[PDB]
Amino acid sequence: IMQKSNKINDALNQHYKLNVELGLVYAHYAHVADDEFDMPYLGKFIQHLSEDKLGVHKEYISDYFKRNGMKLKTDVSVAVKSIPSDAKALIQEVYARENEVRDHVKAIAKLALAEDDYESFYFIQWYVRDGLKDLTEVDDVVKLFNSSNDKLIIEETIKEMVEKEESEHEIWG
Amino acid sequence: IMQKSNKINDALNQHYKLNVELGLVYAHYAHVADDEFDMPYLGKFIQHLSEDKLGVHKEYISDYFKRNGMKLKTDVSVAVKSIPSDAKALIQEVYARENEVRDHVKAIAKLALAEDDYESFYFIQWYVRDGLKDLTEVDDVVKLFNSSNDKLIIEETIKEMVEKEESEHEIWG
Amino acid sequence: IMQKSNKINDALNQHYKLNVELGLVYAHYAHVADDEFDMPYLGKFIQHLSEDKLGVHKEYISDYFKRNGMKLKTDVSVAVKSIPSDAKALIQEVYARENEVRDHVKAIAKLALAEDDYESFYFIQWYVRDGLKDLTEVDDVVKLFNSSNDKLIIEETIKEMVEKEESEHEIWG
Amino acid sequence: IMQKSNKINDALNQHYKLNVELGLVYAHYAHVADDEFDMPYLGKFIQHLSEDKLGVHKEYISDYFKRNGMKLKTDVSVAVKSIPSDAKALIQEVYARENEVRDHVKAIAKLALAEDDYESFYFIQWYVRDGLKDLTEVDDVVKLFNSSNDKLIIEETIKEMVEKEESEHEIWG
Amino acid sequence: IMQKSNKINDALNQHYKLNVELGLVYAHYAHVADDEFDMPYLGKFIQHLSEDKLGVHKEYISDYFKRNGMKLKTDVSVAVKSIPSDAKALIQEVYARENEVRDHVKAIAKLALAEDDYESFYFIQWYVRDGLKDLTEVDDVVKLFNSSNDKLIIEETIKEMVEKEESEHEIWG
Amino acid sequence: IMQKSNKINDALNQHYKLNVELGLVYAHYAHVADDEFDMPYLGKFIQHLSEDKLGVHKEYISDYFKRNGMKLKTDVSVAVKSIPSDAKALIQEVYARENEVRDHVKAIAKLALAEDDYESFYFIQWYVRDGLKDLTEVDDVVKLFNSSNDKLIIEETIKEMVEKEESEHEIWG
């Protein structure tokens, strides 16, 4: 009874890998944001995101696996070989990656229902919610580049964003 | 004047890579320590170490690069394909890896002097000190497996270790 | 035994002189930043730097000399005969001078090792670290002029910089 | 209307120069007081005076210039080529220099009235008062050398002087 | 890999021995300072120094050895067979011994670099700094005997020295 | 009148020597307890004892000598050439040495009465009491090795012992 789904096990190992590799890319993008583009607050924003991916996003999968018999796999391959040309494009790339996260998560949820794995459907709810939350935070920064042509003005707004004491939306938080 | 050393740049990119990959391996080893070996406090110890490697150890390199013109490279390849057979061997493997850290760091320091890069010699001092500190903490756990054959007794001692409020040795801390 | 190095004595007298003269130039540049360029916060930044050079940078040399038998020399000659054309160039000049500081300090460290003067190598470590720290702070201001064409926006960012309660980086601080 | 006095501008540039050079000499004399004469508290007294000259004494001139259109000049030439033979003579030399300060200040005040520059006459009042205050503090130390032949007794009295929480005389303070 | 240097092991065993024997001599000198020379505060100064040598100076070596595989040796031979004739000479002897400490430490640092032992070079930095700090504190007392011929006046100054709440110099502290 | 006993003077010089040499041996044994036997809490126990011997045990003799005219002698010879084979034997050796302390102290007390030296009989009372107290504390550790074969269990008990806030027995404390 209660035999773990091998299909969910694979999908969640692939999502663990995605969050590790994303976090490593974001750490690089945070360096570049500060170093090459002269936007240290944009750097801090991306760095916070790197740490989210390499922290809780991966941790919760490992924890879940310990509880249900699923096997963890660690297989990572990532290389930053090209960087976006400017800051606007850097954050737009981050946006595209977060949009893909939402698509991957949707798939896992759909799979959990197909496999009648209600514990996994429950688990993924955090990721479903976070898919949108994280995208929204990134979108809030993307908007800035369309609203001013002054990098320092944009930076002042990012500063408040990163320095605000984090509030949780009742639903998406 | 003050042109960055390409040799130091490469050695520090390789050490960034080493700390990323080590941290990912340790995250896996922390999972296994808890999940397979029934030693959650040993897991927490290795997890703290994973976070050290993927946190400050890498961050300080990126920060340094921003200050001196050195280029960051992100190129990561890691796969955990075999795990040690028991807990004793798991921590002994961690020990071996920390010993290798000390050897890599020694090389960077020697190189900094050869290149007359005193800013880099200063920078690496943190890593020289930490090489030993981290090894010592790991050694403290290795010792336990040679001092008791009861996994729960060992776990009780690791618990105090991980839960003690961190003290800094005047020299190695 | 323990006879002071005459070569280190000379190099450190020359560095005392450099820090005095730099501080006097920076005091003038701080006046001009406010008075001629309408950037009082940029003025305060350069003034803080003037006081750093004429304070601790020189004080620590005098203190060291008292401890080891080295002789202090006071020989100062400085005249500000031309000023940079605008604020961007003013801070870029400050940058160039800080870069030269790093080069002079490198030389002292190299000399200390050649003379087997380990007390002097220890002493200069503060200056090695500070060379980079001070350059970084100046670079943070230079960046601003490349990130906005509005002097008041730049000034608002410098204001936060000068008014932030000073934090020390674990390594460079 | 309200065109700045070129004569006052020159006199105040010369007084800026005097305060810079005095402060650099006093910094040397403070070193010697401690290092050569074995009187660290006498050193601290002279050092406090060095910092007064290189601090507020010069700062107030720069500030004034910013307000009225006067031009700041930085032209400094100072070399300590001979030092007084003992501590008594060191402080007596400091006294002579402070007496000369009072004479220079008198001249500026007289000039301000001749030029009908009431803003400058107001400004110099601080310096008129301080001329005497600073001389008095130096005289208080000179007296000590005429009142004891024991350097440590003198040092104990200087210690209280430098360590007393500064009080301001209603008139001269 | 990371095999301990036998040469550094010997040099540090010899420095452990030096600090033990120095501390025992200083304990005797502290007794004599009080008992024979009627200078209890001078006694307390030397006693504090005895405890420094027999405390942290030796402890840090033992700690280091535990971390790196080096072997501790305990081999002590000390006899106080002659004492200096008066207090001035007692502290001058302490001074000579501290000067020799600095010379021994210099040698260890030089050796660490020759052996490419960067962990040992890091370790010895504490001792390099302390060599000078301790000498300075002793010099501060030596000076007193050249500044007064009254033993009680000297004692009053030593009292403040030993009773001041210890401050750390940014570099030498 | 009140001429010091030369016999008591010698016995107390020999006891000063014994406490110095014991303390140096115990410092070595504390190192070995931690380093070789993997028992850091046992190390801390022996280290506390080293510091007791080299602290108050010797200090009180020096103090007494200052008060009564007795002469202090410093003559120390100690070499740790063999170490006990295991931890049990290490603490048993410490026990044997403490038992010998009690025997030496008994002799001094007996001598004080024979010499009608009541001040010395009073003085030695501290040492008579401490002979037993210190032996008892050591016995409490010896017992542990006879009560468990698990080094970590023993270590947990030693930890409480060394970390308990010290209580004084009404008689032996």
Ligand SMILES: [Cl-]
């Ligand atoms: Cl199923």
Ligand SMILES: [Cl-]
């Ligand atoms: Cl080079």
Ligand SMILES: [Cl-]
């Ligand atoms: Cl030399």
Ligand SMILES: [Cl-]
């Ligand atoms: Cl006019």
Ligand SMILES: [Cl-]
């Ligand atoms: Cl070697």
Ligand SMILES: [Cl-]
């Ligand atoms: Cl008798």
Ligand SMILES: [Fe+3]
């Ligand atoms: Fe995925």
Ligand SMILES: [Fe+3]
């Ligand atoms: Fe930054």
Ligand SMILES: [Fe+3]
């Ligand atoms: Fe967040």
Ligand SMILES: [Fe+3]
């Ligand atoms: Fe979790």
Ligand SMILES: [Fe+3]
């Ligand atoms: Fe598992």
Ligand SMILES: [Fe+3]
């Ligand atoms: Fe590739």
Ligand SMILES: [Fe+3]
């Ligand atoms: Fe790429």
Ligand SMILES: [Fe+3]
């Ligand atoms: Fe850009």
Ligand SMILES: [Fe+3]
């Ligand atoms: Fe674009």
Ligand SMILES: [Fe+3]
């Ligand atoms: Fe499906």
